[PDB]
Curated annotation (Swiss-Prot), chain A:
Belongs to the peptidase T1A family. The chain holds residues 5 to 144 of 288 of the full protein. It comes from the Eukaryota. Present with 12000 molecules/cell in log phase SD medium. The 26S proteasome consists of a 20S proteasome core and two 19S regulatory subunits. The 20S proteasome core is composed of 28 subunits that are arranged in four stacked rings, resulting in a barrel-shaped structure. The two end rings are each formed by seven alpha subunits, and the two central rings are each formed by seven beta subunits. The catalytic chamber with the active sites is on the inside of the barrel. This is Probable proteasome subunit alpha type-7. Disulfide bonds: none annotated. Transmembrane segments: none annotated. The proteasome degrades poly-ubiquitinated proteins in the cytoplasm and in the nucleus. It is essential for the regulated turnover of proteins and for the removal of misfolded proteins. The proteasome is a multicatalytic proteinase complex that is characterized by its ability to cleave peptides with Arg, Phe, Tyr, Leu, and Glu adjacent to the leaving group at neutral or slightly basic pH. It has an ATP-dependent proteolytic activity.
From Swiss-Prot, chain B:
InterPro entries: Ntn_hydrolases_N, Proteasome_beta4, Proteasome_bsu_CS, Proteasome_sua/b, Proteasome_suB-type. It holds the Pfam family Proteasome. One of its GO terms (biological process) is proteasomal ubiquitin-independent protein catabolic process. The lineage of its organism: Eukaryota, Fungi, Dikarya, Ascomycota, Saccharomycotina. Present with 16900 molecules/cell in log phase SD medium. It comes from Saccharomyces cerevisiae (strain ATCC 204508 / S288c) (Baker's yeast). Belongs to the peptidase T1B family. The 26S proteasome consists of a 20S proteasome core and two 19S regulatory subunits. The 20S proteasome core is composed of 28 subunits that are arranged in four stacked rings, resulting in a barrel-shaped structure. The two end rings are each formed by seven alpha subunits, and the two central rings are each formed by seven beta subunits. The catalytic chamber with the active sites is on the inside of the barrel. Interacts with CIC1. SUPFAM superfamilies: N-terminal nucleophile aminohydrolases (Ntn hydrolases) (SSF56235). This is Proteasome subunit beta type-7.
Amino acid sequence: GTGYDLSNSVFSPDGRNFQVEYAVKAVENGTTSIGIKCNDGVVFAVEKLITSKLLVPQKNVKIQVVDRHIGCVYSGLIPDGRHLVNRGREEAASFKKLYKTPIPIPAFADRLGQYVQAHTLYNSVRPFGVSTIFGGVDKN
Amino acid sequence: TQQPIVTGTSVISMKYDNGVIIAADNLGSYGSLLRFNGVERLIPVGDNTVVGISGDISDMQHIERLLKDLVTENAYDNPLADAEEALEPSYIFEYLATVMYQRRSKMNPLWNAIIVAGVQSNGDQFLRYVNLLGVTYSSPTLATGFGAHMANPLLRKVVDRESDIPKTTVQVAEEAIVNAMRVLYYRDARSSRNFSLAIIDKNTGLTFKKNLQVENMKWDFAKDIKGYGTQKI
């Protein structure tokens, strides 16, 4: 029948999660942001739609730092993006506390990956309305 | 409730006309055994604050990690992390003072005596003390443990009260600090010859000096002393 798109963790007849796909629509509606990997680093850039002349220039910072070597930028629901960075900052601090060394980028990528995937397993939680571009420099 | 295992002795400090000077030796004692000699006990936080810690070394390393996390946390969502919203010596101390008192209230203290030395954003000198009990106080001169008995009397001869501070130059202040480190090496059995010295000035900034040694020692008079009372040869 129908109604497969009402609940989060529900599989549709064709093996799809519509609530996740509906969250992608919130990202596509959002501001454009990019990331460029260079020869020895990464560069993040983001558009900042000036709604009115009342907005104070160079103040509403969108790009966020995790630890001291990871930069994060996202598109879509800005509050959802901040929630993910807050988790990543806790996740990076937990890694450094136990292993001394700052968290590797592929290691940090999985930590956010497992956390976002977790929000697709239950009907009590909503999927993240953000696509996050992130990275930095580590051991290799 | 715990007991200190690997320990660090005195941390001495004083304030002059333009800033503060702090010093501590590089020893990590294991009871009566002088076990470790490459221990830095002065932790610089930013470029305006230096934290001198005495007592339990394992607890010092914990505090050292907390200070590094404070710098990381302050830079989060803060575009003025290196300007107006940078970590002040007063912010760093008050945080440590809160932790020290909370741990003693839970009967699990950090076995340390800490002196926070630095210069505020407006140019004011900062020098405050906090111990394992959470007891806090400020004075023109501050010293922990054994330095409180020996270095303080010497440093108070230079700056006795608040009015003596603007009359004291960097040259005179450092001379009194280096001299006090020699006296501590003379009479403290848990002291090292090698030490570090940090100067935080409102003009020249932070000057961290490493691998300093106690020089100009008087020992020649020992040859003339023989026996303990009546012995002549």
